[PDB]
């Protein structure tokens, strides 16, 4: 089992070469733009759920009131066997005539 990774394909087809030369519409992409307005910039700042769960809903600007809010941000089968029926009881207790000979 010589793992030489020897494969017959060690070149390229000229058909594939020209196909790559012409069809360059699969390697390019579109443009990723950044927030186009301020409101979207803000919502990218605070829209993350980590900030959504660590900030007031009604915006409070003063750090005093922000502290007033954020200080409230803090950090077997036994029950199933209760439904079972009462124990049962076990099915265990846990507790020739001599003949008449004819007289002589």
């Amino acid at each position: 089992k010589r793992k030489l990774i020897v494969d017959s394909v060690k070149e390229l087809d000229s058909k594939t070469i020209r196909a790559q030369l012409s069809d360059y519409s699969d390697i390019v992409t579109t443009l990723d733009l950044a927030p186009p307005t301020k409101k979207l910039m803000m919502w990218k700042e605070t829209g993350g759920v980590e900030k959504l769960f660590s900030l007031p809903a009604q915006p409070l600007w003063n750090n005093r009131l922000l502290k007033l809010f954020t200080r409230c941000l803090t950090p077997n089968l036994d029950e199933f066997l209760k439904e079972f029926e009462n124990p049962e009881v076990p099915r265990e207790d846990q507790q020739e005539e001599p003949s008449r000979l004819q007289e002589s």
Binding site: E88, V89, P90, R91, E92, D93
Partner: protein
């Protein structure tokens, strides 16, 4: 193991388990360990503690029943499963000798190649491996390769017929549940004391005796003894109208039956359903049973009702070994201790299954079905065993 059959030469082999992982004493000691655990848990009050123990013992018994099939019998369950009497084994009953003997076989027997062909699809490749290595020592290539390719070529060959089975076990192998073995589930399986019993059954069956095996179990000829002592309220509560409304039945509930009445049941009627403690060795001892002829199938549903207690090196002892001597056709009794609700479920299942099936209904088939009624399907579901010859309705 000896598979004796008509027009069949004796096929006998060994199955040493002292070289494997689950030795033949490990199983027989785990059975006793589970029995002691059950006896200990029998007096627990906490529902949480009691139910934990039952559910921890059912798993162990389930493990054990499969050990017998996985470790002890090994590549020889085909010798227990009905052998294929079809003219299909013959193609190899001499083909796998002319090479197996050449590869190293010492004693080239010829029946071991026909007792296994039935259910050829059910034959497994690892089964084949042992069947090959043992049959073929020395040269390791042909030894397996030939047997494996030959058996593979013969797969899904045919379908099995009906052939009742009368397994005989010794003084210590009688208590292990050998009926639930995941190869003997569908087939009808009983257990007789010996072989002369099996043939005396035919003698009695030919001289117009043992009427049950001649006509059948009349569904209007059953006698029941329920709750001889006022201790089990759940039983009476469940089986009161069901055991009373039954057409043409008679029995006793609450009061301890008098000796005359119980002797009459086993002698005059055809079926004896016992619901109580033990086997009623208090109201009918083996002594009274031997002093009468048994014309009724015994369905005795109480703890260790069919258990031959091995009180030392001595052989078994119990009521079953004295019903069979009276001519009892079949004998259904539990092997280990049982509780109320599970064995009541088993009894209700079997009775409705057998007495609702209709005329000509094997009892063993509906037992194999009623085994799945108990909640713990391996600790109160695998207990009922059968002693005797197959019984049925008319």
């Amino acid at each position: 193991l000896t598979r004796l059959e008509k027009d069949s030469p004796p096929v006998s082999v060994q199955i040493p388990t002292g070289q494997n992982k689950l030795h033949l004493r490990s199983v027989l000691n785990e059975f006793d360990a589970i029995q002691k655990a059950q006896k200990e848990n029998s007096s627990c009050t906490d529902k949480r503690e009691w139910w934990t123990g039952r559910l921890a013992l059912d798993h162990r018994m389930e493990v054990l029943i499969a050990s017998l099939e996985k470790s002890v019998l090994g590549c020889w369950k085909g010798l227990l499963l009905p052998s294929s009497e079809e003219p299909g084994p013959a193609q190899e009953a001499s083909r796998l000798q002319e090479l197996l003997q050449d590869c190293g076989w010492k004693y080239p027997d010829r029946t071991l190649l026909k007792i296994m062909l039935s259910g050829a699809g059910a034959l497994t490749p690892q089964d084949i491996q042992a069947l090959a290595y043992g049959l073929c020592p020395t040269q390791p290539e042909r030894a397996q390769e030939l047997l494996n390719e030959a058996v593979g070529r013969l797969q899904g060959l045919t379908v099995p017929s009906n052939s009742h089975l009368v397994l005989v076990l010794d003084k210590d192998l009688q208590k292990l549940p050998w009926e639930s073995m995941p190869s003997l589930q569908a087939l009808p399986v009983t257990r007789l004391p010996s072989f002369r019993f099996l043939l005396s059954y035919s003698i009695i069956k030919e001289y117009g005796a043992s009427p049950v095996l001649s006509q059948g179990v009349d569904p209007r000829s059953t006698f029941y003894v329920l709750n001889p002592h006022n201790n089990l309220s759940s039983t009476e509560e469940q089986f009161r109208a069901n055991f009373s409304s039954e057409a043409g039945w008679r029995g006793v509930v609450g009061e301890v039956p008098r000796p005359e009445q119980v002797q009459e049941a086993l002698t005059k009627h055809d079926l004896y359903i016992y619901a109580g403690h033990g086997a009623g060795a208090r109201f009918l001892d083996g002594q009274a049973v031997l002093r009468l002829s048994c014309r009724a199938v015994a369905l005795l549903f109480g703890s260790s009702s069919a258990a031959l207690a091995v009180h030392g090196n001595l052989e078994g002892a119990g009521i079953v070994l004295k019903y069979i001597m009276a001519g009892c056709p079949l004998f259904l009794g539990n092997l280990w201790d049982v509780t109320d609700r599970d064995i009541d479920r088993y009894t209700e299942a079997l009775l409705q299954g057998w007495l609702g099936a209709g005329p000509g209904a094997p009892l063993l088939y509906y037992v194999n079905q009623a085994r799945q009624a108990p909640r713990l399907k391996y600790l109160i579901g695998a207990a009922p065993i059968a002693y005797g010859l197959p019984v049925s309705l008319r």
